[PDB]
Amino acid sequence: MEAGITGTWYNQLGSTFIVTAGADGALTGTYVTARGNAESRYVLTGRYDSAPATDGSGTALGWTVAWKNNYRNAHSATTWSGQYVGGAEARINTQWLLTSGTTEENAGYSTLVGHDTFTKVKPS
Amino acid sequence: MEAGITGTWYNQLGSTFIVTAGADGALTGTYVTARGNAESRYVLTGRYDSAPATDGSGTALGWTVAWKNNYRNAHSATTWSGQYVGGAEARINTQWLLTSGTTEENAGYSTLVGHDTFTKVKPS
Amino acid sequence: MEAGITGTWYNQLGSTFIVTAGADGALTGTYVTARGNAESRYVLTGRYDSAPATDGSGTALGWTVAWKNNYRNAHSATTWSGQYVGGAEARINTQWLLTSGTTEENAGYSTLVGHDTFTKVKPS
Amino acid sequence: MEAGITGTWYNQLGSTFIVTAGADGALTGTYVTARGNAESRYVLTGRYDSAPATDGSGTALGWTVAWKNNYRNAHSATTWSGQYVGGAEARINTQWLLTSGTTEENAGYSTLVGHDTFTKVKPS
Ligand SMILES: [Cl-]
Ligand SMILES: [Cl-]
Ligand SMILES: [Cl-]
Ligand SMILES: [Cl-]
Ligand SMILES: [Cl-]
Ligand SMILES: [Cl-]
Ligand SMILES: [Cl-]
Ligand SMILES: [Cl-]
Ligand SMILES: [Cl-]
Ligand SMILES: [Cl-]
Ligand SMILES: [Cl-]
Ligand SMILES: [Cl-]
Ligand SMILES: [Cl-]
Ligand SMILES: [Cl-]
Ligand SMILES: [Cl-]
Ligand SMILES: [Cl-]
Ligand SMILES: [Cl-]
Ligand SMILES: [Cl-]
Ligand SMILES: [Cl-]
Ligand SMILES: [Cl-]
Ligand SMILES: [Cl-]
Ligand SMILES: [Cl-]
Ligand SMILES: [Cl-]
Ligand SMILES: [Cl-]
Ligand SMILES: [Cl-]
Ligand SMILES: [Cl-]
Ligand SMILES: [Cl-]
Ligand SMILES: [Cl-]
């Protein structure tokens, strides 16, 4: 269990996610891209690794969004890998990989990499 | 639905996973590290993006394993991002990020990157 | 030629580099880690791709530091890949890979990934 | 000095590079893409970290190619980060980042990630 993960998080570019952390390591919820209607909402699922933190170490986690809903099918999926830190400056610091379905010929250029910082309050 | 994903896949280093692809984009199953007893089995969850493939393009997907079970708590989690290609040379080509829980001071060095190729038959 | 690259840049964690951009795409200079004496100075070399910017697009570049000098031999090297943007909010936004020399057995865990933002003035 | 690095290396997809390892950590040479005429040749520069190998550990290195020559200007640059291992199965195992110059709006999707294995003899 890591109750501090459960809730709404915002990246610095206008996306949102609402996650529930389950007692035995499940992450489930919804990822909302910058626009922010039903057209913009996607299922997310992942896992987190709770431990008896010894040195206010972060909590490791990851999740996936496949970019398909009732309004869009981007032929793509993103995974985020990172850690949650609680407290007054609570954050989920992540790196992400975005893979698109490609032909074999273009498979070398299938995967973008980047980073996201999620906070409990919106940027700007 | 992408029925060809469902089943057992092997990386080139001795790990296994058994996944079920659900009809509306869910991935669920178990990841087994090289040793291969109950000590070595972990929950995995992820998502895939099925589409009406136009040019035998791959199917985008991702999943997460938190490295905690009844026998180990590695304070870590890995995400795989990649694509499934079916047929005679079926494969899931992936890149992965492995994040460990760290102190703030060591947060810069929290995340390893690499790659895995999964096939329907074992290597060697 | 991209004269705006030439000079001193600071990351948000206390490192510095002083680079010269050569007329035909060379980057040469010195990278200084957080402490900031001779013990902390390393050779850097890389390349940049100048073009007749059409839409204030960034300038692609990359460089390498091998973490060996007269005072340290970390058995490691980092590459930065990113783009330079000039003007009032000048920056070099980068992602980096840090590889350590390993045994074959540990080769899978050889490479860390992260990100750095460089600015013309120091953080904080 | 690491004399075993100096020479010609081939990736598994038809590219070539010819590198010279200098005595004090310099890498210099030429990268040739799959086609393989003057149109396909680019300057490379990087660094390697030589050390008194204790356990046949690899040698850490990195290099950059800006994708501009007299025939092409791709507004891009790739960095490779990896390690050299000598002997009967000599190889340079790498991960790479490819960044394109973008607008600010598209900066999030500027950087592709992948992997290359270089050997002394051609694939296939
Ligand atoms: Cl986002
Ligand atoms: Cl749970
Ligand atoms: Cl959307
Ligand atoms: Cl929907
Ligand atoms: Cl494609
Ligand atoms: Cl962000
Ligand atoms: Cl970030
Ligand atoms: Cl594995
Ligand atoms: Cl489903
Ligand atoms: Cl294990
Ligand atoms: Cl278990
Ligand atoms: Cl730590
Ligand atoms: Cl593999
Ligand atoms: Cl692979
Ligand atoms: Cl640094
Ligand atoms: Cl030059
Ligand atoms: Cl240092
Ligand atoms: Cl020195
Ligand atoms: Cl090692
Ligand atoms: Cl930074
Ligand atoms: Cl950054
Ligand atoms: Cl190549
Ligand atoms: Cl040299
Ligand atoms: Cl070319
Ligand atoms: Cl040329
Ligand atoms: Cl662009
Ligand atoms: Cl390759
Ligand atoms: Cl490879």
Numbering used by the authors:
A (entry chain A), B (entry chain A), C (entry chain A), D (entry chain A): 1 to 124
Reported in the publication:
The long-wavelength beamline I23 at Diamond Light Source overcomes these limitations and extends the accessible wavelength range to λ = 5.9 Å. In this study, we report the determination of diverse protein structures by experimental phasing techniques carried out at long wavelengths on beamline I23 at Diamond Light Source using S, Ca, K, Cl, V, I, Cd, and P as anomalous scatterers. Native-SAD uses light atoms naturally occurring in proteins or bound to proteins. We demonstrate that long-wavelength native-SAD has become a very compelling technique, where a low multiplicity dataset from a single crystal can be sufficient for successful structure determination, making it a general vehicle of choice for experimental phasing.
A second example of a protein without any sulfur atoms is the streptavidin mutant Streptactin XT28. Data were collected at λ = 2.75 Å from crystals that diffracted to better than 1.8 Å resolution. The structure could easily be solved with seven chloride ions bound to the protein although the data was not collected at the chlorine absorption edge (Cl K-edge = 4.39 Å). To the best of our knowledge, this is the first example of Cl-SAD.
